[PDB]
C-alpha cells in the first residue's frame, strides 16, 4: 500500500531522466556537438547556432 | 594591396586560402567595408609585371 512514498521517487527519477535526455535534442541546428560546429564552421553564423 | 580576381573571395571573415592564411587575415569580429575593382588597364604588362 506504499504507493504514496514510491510515487515521489518515481516522479523525481523520471524528471531527472528527461532532463538528462534533453541534451541530445538538435533544436534544428546542424549538429548537437559544440566542438563540431565551432571547428567545422566559420564564426559568423556558428555564433548564432 | 593587389590580388587576383578569382581569389578575392578570401578577403572576408572566416575563409581560408593562401593569402587568408599567410598574407592578410581578417579577425573574427570585423566592422568595415571592402572595396575591389578591376585594374587591368594599369597593372598589366605585355612583357610581364
Amino acid at each position: 500500500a506504499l504507493g504514496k512514498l514510491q510515487d515521489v521517487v518515481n516522479h523525481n527519477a523520471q524528471a531527472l531522466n528527461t532532463l538528462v535526455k534533453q541534451l541530445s535534442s538538435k533544436f534544428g541546428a546542424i549538429s548537437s556537438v559544440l566542438n563540431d560546429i565551432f571547428s567545422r564552421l566559420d564564426p559568423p553564423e556558428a555564433e548564432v547556432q | 594591396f593587389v590580388i587576383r580576381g578569382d581569389e578575392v573571395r578570401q578577403i572576408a571573415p572566416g575563409q581560408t586560402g593562401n593569402i587568408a592564411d599567410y598574407n592578410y587575415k581578417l579577425p573574427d569580429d570585423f566592422t568595415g567595408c571592402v572595396i575591389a575593382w578591376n585594374s587591368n588597364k594599369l597593372d598589366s604588362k605585355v612583357s610581364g609585371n
Partner: protein, 50 residues
C-alpha cells in the same frame, strides 16, 4: 601533342606534395582552385593528360 594520352587516377590517396620538388622553382600555375589547399578538400575523379 596531337595524340595526347589520358589516364584515370582513381581509388587512391593523392600526394601533391611531391610535385613541388620538380623544376628549379616551378612552372606550376593553377586555374580555378587554390593551389595550396588541394590536400584537405576531396574530389570525385582526377583525369591526367601528358
Amino acid at each position: 601533342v596531337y595524340a595526347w594520352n589520358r589516364k584515370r587516377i582513381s581509388n587512391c590517396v593523392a600526394d601533391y606534395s611531391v610535385l613541388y620538388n620538380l623544376a628549379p622553382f616551378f612552372t606550376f600555375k593553377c586555374y580555378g582552385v587554390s593551389p595550396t589547399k588541394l590536400n584537405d578538400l576531396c574530389f570525385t575523379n582526377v583525369y591526367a593528360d601528358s
